[PDB]
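To whoever picks this up:

The nightly regression suite flagged Multiple inositol-polyphosphate phosphatase as changed. Nothing in the input moved, so I suspect the structure step. Input below, exactly as stored in the fixture:
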Amino acid sequence: ETAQYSTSKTPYSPQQDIRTYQPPPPGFTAVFTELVSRHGSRTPTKIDGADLLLQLWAKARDESELTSAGQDFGPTMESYRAAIQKVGLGQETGRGRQELQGMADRMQRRLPELFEKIKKDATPIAVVLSQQTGRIADTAKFFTARLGATDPALAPLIQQPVVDQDLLYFHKTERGKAYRDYLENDQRYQETVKRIKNRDGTREAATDILKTIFTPAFVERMEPSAVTKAAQALYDLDAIAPDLSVEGNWHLDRFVPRHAAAWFASIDDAKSFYKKGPGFEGSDITFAMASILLDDFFKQAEAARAGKLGADLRFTHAEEIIPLAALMQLPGSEKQADPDEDYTYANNPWRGASVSPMAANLQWDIYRNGTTYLVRMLYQEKEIPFKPDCTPFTPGSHYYRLDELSRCFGRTAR
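Regenerated output under the current build:
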């Protein structure tokens, strides 16, 4: 566990040791692999919350309304702010680099026979991006540079990156138009978000957060709206602090009680569940747009039978991984909400931390024996089954015939 209450800011950790994956059936050897990964751990995209808190802190300091621990909040947040600005807002941290390096390491150690075959055949390793610059391009570079550092003979086969916004940025392209209209205009969705936001408990959690730093009287002198906003800002900065573990340790949990973090995490997860995840029973508005990416996993696997491509490496955002997982009914995303019963941690398994942590990723390994192609799926590098109407190669197996997967996803008849 890299973090307990950070939802989709949770830093990455592989969820299985590669030595415990099921081995491929006898005579099957790796011939293709393909990946889609969110960027690694990053800084906040905005600094305004840090300045809001630093301005509030300076006022309480001047009024002599700081707690004992609150004395150190100013220096702590100034230091944290400076580290964020030195990395750059919305940019990859040193932990994010380490995350992608680790994923590259385990891919090469998991499929040594594939990378030998790729060098034998001179087949390319494609690299595909959601956008041309930023944390996305750096994420890909962390991964591909590690592949080439471990195996310099692989480096000339790794292709220069290309951008495919329909494939890896669909929530912001034309594919996402109906989805965005739904968010803006659907009354049931708007009512549900409002209900989540108005859950009783935020005011108490917010005051519990501010009271680590400020006297109760200072907190009561604030406008309630300002209490909510400052507490949210501090929860957010505490939530993402683990992403910056390489840059420092600011012990921001001093200022966010655990019960308050748990509350704010449950609010974030509920909102994201409806905005981006499985959503309401019977509706695919939040994730049908991801069909192009599921399509592509199939398209590239079938192409690999044609011997063209060695591996396909794709890099994108949570806003692509989350809907892909709901569309595929991956573990954690298989349960849509009854409209008469709002999402809660008790009635639904969906969590940002497990569905879409930083460097959230899905991988398919394709193995061949004669004319038979088997697929094994890794999710956060845990070996997982496909949805239950897909039949494994043998009972209990995590390997699936590629033509069985095409059938059970409706691409073919049999």
